[model samples]
Target: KLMDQPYSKTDFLMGTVVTLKIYDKGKEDVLDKGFDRIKDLAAKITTSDSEKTSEVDKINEQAGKKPVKVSEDVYYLIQEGLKYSENSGGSFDITIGPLTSLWHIGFSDARKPSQAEIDAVLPLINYKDVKMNDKDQTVYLEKEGMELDLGAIAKGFITDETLKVFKENKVTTSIIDLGGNIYVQGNNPNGNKWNVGIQDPFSPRGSVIGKLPESNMSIVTSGIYERYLEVDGKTYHHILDPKTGYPFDNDIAGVSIVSKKSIDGDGLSTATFSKGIKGGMDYIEQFEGVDAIFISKEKKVYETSGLKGQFELTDKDFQMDT
Candidate 1:
């Protein structure tokens, strides 16, 4: 049973629960070391008020005033997130802090905001206004009150970094889960591709509607099931549109993007989901190694060309659609 179970460790970090399991013997000591690195990388971009202020908080507090210098971590995160914002046709925006904070989704204070409140933050949602100076390693928000939120893509970067630790320690097999953003390490200790379940969007977290068998790859899912706000009989999901400052309303209920890097999967999931099913497939297909699975609100499933025969249907509640 040496390879049957892993040396597993789970802790709270990156604003979510993180569990890292190492299958290689004698590598169990790296769990805390891996989590330590995640905390450091996360601290670079996450907002903080204590003496250990984050670089992101400084950039937001000084928005419209002057450019704030940042570390390589913050610099790369903002730069990459901006690409998705522009490429996503306004779906995955990094400059959504003002709007996200106003609605306060994913927090205990989440609520339905008035249209006026949304209007005030809509103009501040432009990723174009995020100015970066690569030479000086600085980031500046052009408009006052404009804030930056890298929440959408930060988990991917964090998970990837955690992998670096495992790789450095020469751990052969592992599973890094940052609140559902997973990097299914090498072969499943049993010598087969890991059968990763694509969560049923309407069902609870572990409810599996389909399974994707892969190894040494990252898979990320974005869906309404993450968090939402309710107003009377209506509910608003967390993924917001930079244009309307409201949760994107479409037939699609969720999207899971599979790619080499978790960052791309994280960035593309929201952007692709914004397009609904058909357009999302068309959008994601352009990328070579990237594939996607989109589940519609009507209980129909769609997949990119790469996963046609490979994606297996697991639950009877859903039907596959070409």
Candidate 2:
């Protein structure tokens, strides 16, 4: 009898460990092709490489000079990103690249920037300054140092596209893990629901505050634990507030957004984190298909009404707020 385990592939892309698992046989080439497409997409979307010019690179390099046209994929990505930015009331801005580089948070060179350094770049961090010409599929930044960083939403977008590639190859059951961003396609191989653990914000990896019930959906988490810098007994995380030009100072330690559209989860996770527990819950209530699980600084867990019975709190120290 043939084995029932999934055929999987793992590679490093977009500065994260990515894994693609398909519960189908005779699809090795399909897996190879899917990853190749992802790498190509990353080359176009990533701003990590200064030597390589991408659509993001083009826009950044020619900021305030000329509008640069991009592929439909990137254009739509930015369009969706801006829409999320608007929905979040600028809580999740894509043009926070200058701030990201200024702090270099999550990198070996991460450091706290001076107040003057932050003030100088605050003007360039607005998503409203990013102009998109729908007719030509072009993107332009208003200022010379302005930039576009898709770090918040790119993995989700790439995961969605990877799912499309898998579907094209007749893949019905699979799981895509782009680091913390996860998307489960269809049900599990054994006809069981895919139970995913919500990471414990205060604990190490593989630790869970709760488990999300099985579903065909996307789970994306934004948290302070992912990356940070400690200085003078204070902590600064990677998620920055566009208005203040500093790490978001809120009661929220992390937020996990569950949604049908993967990219929505990506943007909402960060937005929800920025908004805090009460405000985040209020913001998520406005969306139809999205629900969120919020972990506060006090180790309390709060989830949306839809997730009431679905999220099973396993950790004893954590209380689930109804």
Candidate 3:
């Protein structure tokens, strides 16, 4: 009564694909009911349509004003993000939207914004300005022109939600990949775990660094390998520093995190990317039940103690070390 096929769609949602595989043995009506519920939750919670109350819309609407109250799902994810930001010192700020909006790095006309422009926006980009009053479930941005982008956080957040919905619908075996950020529940029906490919940041055609031990866990990776544009021989990427309004240059090529909880994985991937390698390693070491892999600027690979058994570090004929 469930589908076991891989389905994908493009040009409809953020140039990313949302996919799911469900395992069930029941009447068509029952299967369709679960499928319908999954689809509805994805759209209602994650879509970017103008009128929808997606994380994106709520963020855009709350710009230059009070923080709009988010759904329980978003609040939980944002709360985790705030914790990481505090731990990583402003590196993982969602309030980096001023810089993100300025660069719009993937657009054809992308170019470096000026220092004055960057400085002008700096005052409005403070993560400290982001306020969360959990007593009333309210979020507030203290300054005008301050903004938040869930781009780094929303995908992982939604992936976790999708998995939760699957479990609620009695789908113990499923995998939902939201544009490469993956969340798998139980093991694959064929008795194998999910194999994920970590993109090479230096080259388009390269091999993966490792595979994860399949279980009820989530994996999220962030790298400089994609979503960028080159203008006038200069390339600009989507990652930006709330402090500089420019791409962070902390020497991290890519960072991947795996945890039993997917939303936390999502939060860490962004937080650590912002932290780069040195800071990421120290930050992750303080947390348990989470493992991370980092590719440094020198093409070196480093992983947390927890990842030693679950991850493999394959040298791609590149000069590197731990």
Candidate 4:
């Protein structure tokens, strides 16, 4: 249905597929240009403080203001991320940079910080500190020295924007994968829905659970199983609870969320990971167009009624129906 070739020099292996006519008929030239435009827009919005004029830079610029006005796209995604933060009761704060930078857990020299050092930075991690004015499209951090790191939610926001660009460019069917956070634009070109394998936490690769149908939807999954560093035989995960200045202690091994919007899916993954099964499932159930799949400490699997059939249970000893 599509050709396999790199469509642009800006990014190697960037264009994976496209209809032959679209490529052979010279329409590829226009799309290649469109691709660059889209990437440029994405880079502008999702740039890190490490990059120029990024969302991070904007936050850093107005570290302690009444919230600076932002683009609607950026504003809404920040709102979405904040919703998860409030819903999870500060367990899922983006303002945890102070602690994240303090530990440098995955660094060559990973060492625990003193209690005094953690206490000094803990006050800055509060999500309630983030105040937004929707009418003016502004964001504010209540206290000074507070930073916002959009590492978890930025990918989803960028994915959503890229999909919007594709749609505007008349791309009806596509798969956008930002290093595994997948946004499937439409049903497969083969008349089937997209099926994404939910990676097994324990497996080297591939699914330990099952694949999920992802036609016209976004799937975001995060877990303790994916990243960590061993220190004195104890592993510290990437997910940190803003309240404790430490990783979440819940028995959850992983969480996967399915939703219509990539940004929502991304926000929910990080938010729910911090909230654990009992709170996350309950919160997700209240919302329409969203479903959750949770893997607990005992290797037990729990999923919403709608997602029960969508997940594959490879953990033979683990109960899937629970």
Candidate 5:
């Protein structure tokens, strides 16, 4: 199985499991260095734990009061987060901190909020209210209760950064998986493109319905099954809408994005999912060297032109839609 072994380590950070694997036999040292950077970067960038002090937490803690200066890397990451938020046509918002924290999906206290509770945070979800100063590299949220949540792009950003560490350390092949947002660097141990799997949205994790051969790229997916809140037999997905104050409901069950940059794929996965099928497909097609695989609720799979014939089915229950 891809050389049967890897220099890999798993750790909990940034609110999820982060695993980095290096295939270079002689450069196992890079694994140590790579994971070290992951831990360091995660602590600096995280905002999930209110008790923990992080660059993002400082920004959120100040909210309406004042701007917080951040490190170069953290500031750059926030800049990218806001950029994707701005480009998503209201489908994604980096300022969704207050809302996401209210629902707290994927946590022990996760629950659906009342209409009034949801409404209260709606005003704070506007990305336009955020102010940034490149000269000083500081961030500010206009309103008092506003926050910045980089959950959507942070994992990818971290994975990509870890990758930079691996390469700088002369690692030729490696795999970076941050809660399933994957970035495959180099190739398989046998010197072939590594095969990537797309999880079946209806099944458990690793229940993949399709496989695609890829190299030196990232494959990131966003789906309703990943995290949700249940109430009275109803389940609400985690991908919330800035405009509607609820999960964006549509026929699409899961969407996988293949891109050169994991952060790009990460941001695009949610943004395109918000648009649904045709509109989503149209949205994804606009990017060059980027493609998507959309799994419909009805079990039909649709791929963008670049990935049309490249994706192969591993299970017969799902069919490729024309």
Candidate 6:
């Protein structure tokens, strides 16, 4: 397994920090080309950047006005998002932009929204209203002010895209980190299982409750600990419940999903958070090649049957429920 040093690159893209590390010893353009593809996708998919309006912004601007034709990438992403929305019963919705802007969680100006404000935008959060025409690759929002935010699923899709670029460039092994969304292209150079930490919900970043021995898989987590707004001894996380127009109040503090597709991991992380520990366990158990680790508000951890012996709880404060 001995070879030249890996080529690595890290940049701020898609509104998050992304790192691409490739073990292939050949050209560095592979890394550049990978970043190029990511940047292109970011420009098309991002919605919140006011400095540079993106394809998503164009669609949102034309909400209820006229269907806007988008690129194949945008159309494909929207279609994938709609599938997750339909499957999860709107628990994971790309059309939740109205709620995200209202709460502004994780942003500097984040605040708690009043019930009146939430009620006003609740009607606009339905995913079924995201009309799309595959023939022409166009998207339309039935209601004005209805927006689409791909925050829940975009990174994973992008990760997969970047991985494809890497593979096409003849990269043998690589590690991609789109913020917390991780994809290991192949086994580590050391030939050992990559020990990925399961974030501790009760502690700060870099703190871990357990570690999972993973290789060639995607690991994505959704948690109340990541982005939140605290007010008057109460906390509100970024993961909102589309049904109730509020943060998902569940026994689960966090949900980490391991899957063959990072996009599935991303979607399941949010969907499972909405489901709580019991419902999440039931939901995850039904799927093959997909496992979940759930951390409860009680500081207990639960793993799906597939991850039974693969997950090791390291933090004593958190107990793994067998």
List, residue by residue over 167-271, the lDDT tens digit for candidate 2.
898887788888778888887777778888898877654577878875679988777887788889999988888889888888988788899878888877777
Off by over 4 Å in 3: 1-12, 27-70, 107-109, 132-137, 203-207, 312-320
* lDDT string, candidate 4, 137-198, tens digits: 77888888887766667767766776676667666666666544677766655567777777
Model 5 error, position 60 (Å): 1.0
> Residue 302: error of model 6 in Å?
1.1
List where candidate 2 sits over 4 angstroms from the true fold: 1-3
Provide TM-scores for the models: 0.95, 0.95, 0.80, 0.80, 0.96, 0.95
Q: What TM-score does structure 4 among the candidates reach? A: 0.80
| lDDT (Cα, tens digit) per residue for candidate 1, span 194-231 | 99889898976667797899998998987787777777
User: How many clashing pairs per prediction, in order?
Assistant: 0, 0, 0, 5, 0, 0
Tell me the TM-score of model 6. Answer: 0.95
For candidate 5, list the clashing residue pairs, or say none: none
Per-residue lDDT for 11 in model 5?
79
Please say which candidate is ahead in TM-score: 3 or 6: 6
Query: What local lDDT score does residue 243 receive in model 4, on the 0 to 100 scale?
Result: 78
Could you tell me which 10 consecutive residues in candidate 6 have the lowest summed lDDT?
A: 1-10
Best by lDDT: 1
Candidate 6 backbone clash number: 0
Evaluated at residue 230, the lDDT of candidate 2 is: 89
* Per-model CA lDDT versus the true structure: 0.86, 0.84, 0.66, 0.68, 0.85, 0.85
